[PDB]
Design a protein around this ligand. Structure first.
Ligand SMILES: [Zn+2]
Lengths: 91, 238
């Protein structure tokens, strides 16, 4: 079960990125399960609850999500175990 | 060369120059209480001996502690974390036992003590934090578990750090019909180390293992390593 059931749907998540002024694409972030918290470029995953901040220019939300929260179920559901392990086995 | 300047680059690779390299604790659970319903893990003794020999040759002071209850596994880990690693470059924990799932966003999984009581990988890993063990701060803390079945915030700082967990639940035996032949995953890991530790870092070694596990079946292929190392780890070979 997700830590934030209200953000289980992509539409609810992208909504929170109303005025997003950062380089990291908000659509990608939302697809990767993230939703903006309202302060800085801070986002959290609706399922695992993991938060990420200080995003870099060409940084992929999914890679960052797998790199820091390899145990996320949404992550596993969407990308599969092979993907997660490979992210961790090729830093 | 390209491989020589990477091994030495103190910015890219952990420096493992001390002799001994560090402690290596191996929890080897073979016999479980009848009541738990967990089967005797025959073949584990040979898995243990392979790893004990492996890390000894990698310069670690290996200590084997067998048949530990959940509580005693924790005590043994707290004990290891409570020691002074000031003169060591790395720490290694190896757990061989039955296991079960335990959800966690960073270090999922759990292992059973001989009593059939679970100990999550998260608790095991966090025993070695920079507050309880500053002595191992900035030093690789490796965990190899065979359990037969942007930046984060709150405060912006990279954590976990210098933690590497290889968690395997692959139940296969070297000899698929003989449960005493030893764990296939352990053998594959030992084999890869014997042939590549001298020239390849931990990540590459486990990638080779994952590659092997892959052509063996795969639904498990869960050695699902949780890599939070900040630099490449090249072991100190004989
Ligand atoms: Zn997540």
């Amino acid at each position: 079960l997700p830590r934030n059931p209200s953000m289980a749907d992509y539409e609810a998540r992208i909504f929170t990125f109303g005025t997003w002024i950062y380089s990291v694409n908000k659509e990608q972030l939302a697809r990767a399960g993230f939703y903006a918290l309202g302060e800085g470029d801070k986002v959290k995953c609706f399922h695992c609850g993991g938060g990420l901040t200080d995003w870099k220019p060409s940084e992929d939300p999914w890679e960052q999500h797998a790199k820091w929260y390899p145990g996320c179920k949404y992550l596993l559901e969407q990308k599969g175990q092979e993907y997660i392990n490979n992210i961790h086995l090729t830093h | 060369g390209a491989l020589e300047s990477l091994r030495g680059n103190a910015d890219l690779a952990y420096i493992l120059s001390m002799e001994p390299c560090g402690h290596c604790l191996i929890i080897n659970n073979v016999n479980f209480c009848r009541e738990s319903g967990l089967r005797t893990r025959t073949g584990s003794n040979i898995d243990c001996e392979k790893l004990r020999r492996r890390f000894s040759s990698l310069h670690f002071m290996v200590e084997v502690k067998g048949d530990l209850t959940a509580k005693k596994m924790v005590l043994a880990l707290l004990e290891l974390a409570r020691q002074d690693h000031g003169a060591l470059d790395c720490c290694v924990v190896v757990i061989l036992s039955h296991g079960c799932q335990a959800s966690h966003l960073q270090f999922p999984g759990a292992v059973y003590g001989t009593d059939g009581c679970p100990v999550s990988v998260e608790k095991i890993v966090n025993i070695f934090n920079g507050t309880s063990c500053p002595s191992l701060g900035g030093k690789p803390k490796l965990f190899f578990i065979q359990a037969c079945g942007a930046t984060p915030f709150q405060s912006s700082l990279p954590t976990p750090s210098d933690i590497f967990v290889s968690y395997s639940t692959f139940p296969g035996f070297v000899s698929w019909r003989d449960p005493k032949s030893g764990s296939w995953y352990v053998e594959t890991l030992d084999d890869i180390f014997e042939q590549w530790a001298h020239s390849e870092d931990l990540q590459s070694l486990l990638l080779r293992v994952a590659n092997a596990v892959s052509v063996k079946g795969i639904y498990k292929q869960m050695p699902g390593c949780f890599n939070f190392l900040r630099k490449k780890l090249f072991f100190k070979t004989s």
